[PDB]
């Protein structure tokens, strides 16, 4: 059950969907949405904590995080 703990509710998920122009979702969206976020957080947590051990911090803060995300990738809608 512990592996079933979630960090984002179903209300939030549809809120985030509609603000990206989404008009309707299938039932399995909630799991997929929750599935891929975990991955995101996995990939992110590791880096930020890595730099926490690299900066030899213990109360790791954002300053680690933002570096840990500049490491993740920036998607833009064109080339200019």
Partner 1 sequence: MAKVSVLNVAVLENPSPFHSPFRFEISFECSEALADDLEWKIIYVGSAESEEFDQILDSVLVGPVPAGRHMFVFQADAPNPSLIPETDAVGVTVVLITCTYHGQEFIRVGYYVNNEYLNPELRENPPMKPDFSQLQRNILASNPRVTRFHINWD
Partner 2 sequence: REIRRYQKSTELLIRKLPFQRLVREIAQDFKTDLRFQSAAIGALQEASEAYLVGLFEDTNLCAIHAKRVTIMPKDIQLARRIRGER
Partner 3 sequence: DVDSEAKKLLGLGQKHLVMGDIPAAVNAFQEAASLLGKKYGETANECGEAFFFYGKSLLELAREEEIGNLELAWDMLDLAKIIFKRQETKEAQLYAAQAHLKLGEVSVESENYVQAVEEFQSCLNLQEQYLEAHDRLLAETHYQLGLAYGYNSQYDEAVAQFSKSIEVIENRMAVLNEEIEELKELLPEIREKIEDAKES
Note whether 11 binds partner 3 by CB under 8 A.
Answer: no
**Residue whose structure tokens are 């989404």:** 22
Choices 10-18, 26-34, 39-47, 71-79 (CB under 8 A): range interacting with partner 3: 71-79
Note whether 55 binds partner 2 by CB under 8 A.
Answer: no
Among 1, 55, 58, 78, binds partner 2 (CB under 8 A): 58
Q: State which residue, 56 or 58, has the beta carbon closest to partner 2.
A: 58
Q: 60, 52 in Cβ contact below 8 A?
A: yes
Tokens standing for 68? 């840990």
Alpha carbons 13 and 19: distance in angstroms, whole number:
10
Note whether 73 binds partner 3 by CB under 8 A.
Answer: no
């Amino acid at each position: 059950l512990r592996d079933n703990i979630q960090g984002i509710t179903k209300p939030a998920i549809r809120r985030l969907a509609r603000r990206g122009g989404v008009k309707r979702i299938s039932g399995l969206i909630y799991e997929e949405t929750r599935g891929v976020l975990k991955v995101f957080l996995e990939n992110v947590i590791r880096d930020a904590v890595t730099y926490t051990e690299h900066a030899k911090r213990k109360t790791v803060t954002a300053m680690d995080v933002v570096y840990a995300l500049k490491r993740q990738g920036r998607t833009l809608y064109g080339f200019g």
